[PDB]
């Protein structure tokens, strides 16, 4: 009955996977936000005073 | 023989800054007397140019801030603030942390809600 | 005095910022007397000490802005600005839209396309 | 009397920004004479009213600045800086890029680090 | 013994797949936290001039 119809279910997935993101690319972006974050704050405060 | 070179320039693609970098830190002298209190916040590595109002906020985390207490002052050119007050003791009474913020204006105003803050 | 004590600094964990929370709102209110247009515009909850350029755009959203029904006027310190101006209703024939810019500068260019649009 | 109109406003979703355009360009006149050089870095599509300080870096590419080569001047409005300044050709030796900075004043300082640069 | 223990397996990690992230939707977003990056700048040297 299950001749192979999952050898290509297999596959299936990891074409999906093959895509998708990363979490350090994802973490490195983060930390650049964070960064820019608090940069604005920083000039906004510099410029006020 | 006016030796001339005419050059296009690149746009580059290394931009990081060049000056005071903004990592809050300090320490405190409360230091009572005959009934009055006198607060020095000195702090470093704040925004080069900004003021920052700092008072006494009770117990509450949120709480009431003894507004009679408002330390008002503005950062140099590396970012660094000295803060100088001086409150009644009974004022004081039932404080819980010397909450330093940023100061919209130099007549005080809470544009930060709690840059630094140290436990009394 | 008598009394010391000498705390270092703690960053907090999170500062949240205070004042005004930019939520563009309006209230826009035409008069069309004899060949002649008053328009009282009050926009709350806008940007603190900004400037708010506003004109009639035709239809063509997108369109041409009707230049000579310009309103200049600053928000406060709150974000509460009001535009107030007089064009004859013969040029704003064509007028669909009353687009609020923000300001480069008292009486100038725009540094915005268009943050709040009432349809007419 | 005359007819009268009170629309609400409604934010717009894609407030775009507007005014000039940041895209650093750039062409430089090394002009050499008897003993001195008067050096033109004409820049364009720079930052609207910002100080533009740029000098000649020696060879080390971050390496160390011949500072006697400073040139301060500021951007114009729509980003035109040009900048000029005499330099002995016996001090210059060993330069290799002239680098264009942001500047903090007019009083020289360093903001950015190499917004523009040129080989020679 | 393999009787189907794995037509679930299959099924099993194609369901968190079906959430994660995409390239181009992160891609995007990068290209907006370079242009926050540039702008912040921009504002703080035109303020500061």
Known sequence: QDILDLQDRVSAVEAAQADFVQRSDFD???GRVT??????????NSLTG | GPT??????????????????????????????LGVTRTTITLTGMA?????????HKMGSDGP????????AQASADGKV??????????IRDAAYINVHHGRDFSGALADSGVICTPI
């Open chain 2, 82 to 91: 000295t803060l100088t007050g001086i409150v009644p003791t009974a004022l």
């Open chain 2, 65 to 72: 801030a003894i507004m009679e207490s408002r330390m008002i």
């Open chain 2, 48 to 56: 080069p140019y900004a003021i920052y109002v700092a008072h006494y």
């Open chain 2, 4 to 33: 001339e070179g005419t050059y296009t320039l690149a746009p580059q693609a290394v931009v990081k800054p060049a000056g005071p970098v903004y990592a809050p830190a300090g320490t405190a002298k409360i230091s009572e007397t």
């Open chain 1, 28 to 30: 490195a972006l983060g």
């Open chain 1, 35 to 44: 960064t820019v974050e608090t940069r604005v704050e920083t000039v906004n």
